[PDB]
């Protein structure tokens, strides 16, 4: 497979520029970092909470393990 | 003015079919983007439905000026059959201007950029590529016309 018989396009226009005629990293700090946040807010809720719970079962799993080795009053 | 304002909007429809001339109108539109030179000749359909007599009058009243005009002819005549006749007829022309009315040129820069009107439904694909040219005065045009001649041309009929 290759270019030439993939599929159909009609009445679409493309505007593209050389790289030499433009900076490589325009608005890297300005527009990116707000876009990092918006990128972040849209994933954080359904990514962490499992890993959040993991921090607790890595927490309680060791604490409850430590106690079991300490003697009892008997 | 109103009739031609319809005729113009009949030929923009035609030049869509003059696929070759669409390319150069795209080519000039890119490499010379941002300048007046990216403009078409007949103009967009929008401005043609908005152009006034005064814009013509103002456009006309600035560029048609003797220092930036020429007359020429050849074949069957003598140069002094002619000089009298512009001395006769064109002597009344506005050979001057309001001091700040006649502008000179901006150096039109050059861009390296691609433009593509993707259209798979049509028979063939008209394509063009080019670079910055030197200009009129620069003598190496006599060089480059050779190089193009070295490469040349072909269209589906030459028996070679």
User: Who among B113, B115, B121 is closest to A21 (CB)?
Assistant: B113
Element of type H or E holding B114: strand B113-118
Which residue is it, tokens 């050059």?
B110
Within 8 A by CB and 6+ apart from B141, the residues are B134
Q: What does the alpha-carbon distance between residue A4 and residue B120 come to, in Å, rounded to a whole number?
A: 10
In total, the C-beta contacts within 8 angstroms joining chain A to chain B are 38
Write out B12-68 in H/E/C secondary structure: HHHHCCCHHHHHHHHHHHHHCCCCHHHCCCCCCHHHHCCCCHHHHHHHHHHHCCHHH
Longest dimension (CA), chain B: 60
Q: Positive or negative, the Cα torsion across B65, B69, B70, B71? A: negative
* Whole-angstrom distance, CA of residue B129 vs CA of residue B23: 10
| Structure-block tokens of residue B9 | 């909007």
Q: After which residues is chain A broken (C to N over 2.5 A)?
A: none
**Which of A9, A20, A21 is opposite residue B118, by nearest beta carbon?**
A9
3-class SS at A45? helix
Other beta carbons less than 10 A from residue B31's beta carbon:
21
**Sign of the Cα pseudo-torsion (A23, A29, A35, A40, in order):** positive
Q: Which residue carries 């990092």 as its tokens?
A: A36
Beta bridge partners of B43: none
CA distance B104 to B123: 44
Strand-pair partners of A14 = B116
Interatomic CA distance for residues B157 and B160, integer angstroms: 9
- Which residue in chain B is spatially nearest to A16 when comparing CA positions? B114
Q: Does A22 touch chain B (CB under 8 A)?
A: no
CATH topology of domain A1-74: 1.20.5
Question: Are B118 and A16 inside 8 Å of each other by CB?
Answer: no
Element (H, E) at A36: helix A32-41
DSSP code of B102?
S
Q: Is A71 on the interface with B (CB under 8 A)?
A: no
Min Cα separation A29/chain B (Å): 26
Residues of A in contact with B112 (CB under 8 A): 17-18, 20-21
Total residue count of chain A as it appears in this document: 74
- The coordinates were experimentally obtained by cryo-EM
User: What Å resolution does this PDB entry report?
Assistant: 4.1
B110, B31 contact by CB (below 8 A): yes
Smallest CA-to-CA distance from B30 within B140, B131, B151, B148 is with B131
């Amino acid at each position: 497979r290759q270019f030439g018989h993939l599929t159909r396009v009609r009445h679409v226009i493309t505007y593209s520029l050389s790289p030499f005629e433009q900076r490589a990293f325009p608005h890297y700090f300005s527009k990116g970092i707000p876009n990092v946040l918006r990128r972040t807010r849209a994933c954080i809720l359904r990514v962490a909470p499992p890993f959040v719970a993991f921090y607790l079962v890595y927490t309680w799993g060791t604490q409850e393990f430590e106690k079991s080795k300490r003697k009892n009053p008997a | 003015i109103e009739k031609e304002r319809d005729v113009i909007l009949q030929e923009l429809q035609e030049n869509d079919t003059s696929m070759r001339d669409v390319v150069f109108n795209y080519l000039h539109a890119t490499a010379f983007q941002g300048t007046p030179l990216a403009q078409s000749v007949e103009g967009p359909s929008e401005n043609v439905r908005k152009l006034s007599r005064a814009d013509l009058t103002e456009y006309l009243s600035r560029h048609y000026k003797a220092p930036r005009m020429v007359l020429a002819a050849a074949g069957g005549l003598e140069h002094r059959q002619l000089l009298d006749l512009a001395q006769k007829h064109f002597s009344g022309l506005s050979g001057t201007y309001d001091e700040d009315a006649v502008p000179t040129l901006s150096p039109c820069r050059f861009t390296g950029s691609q433009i593509c009107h993707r259209e798979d439904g049509l028979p063939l694909a008209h394509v063009a590529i080019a670079v910055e040219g030197p200009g009129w005065a620069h003598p190496d045009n006599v060089a480059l016309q050779v190089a193009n001649a070295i490469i040349g041309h072909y269209d589906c009929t030459y028996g070679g």
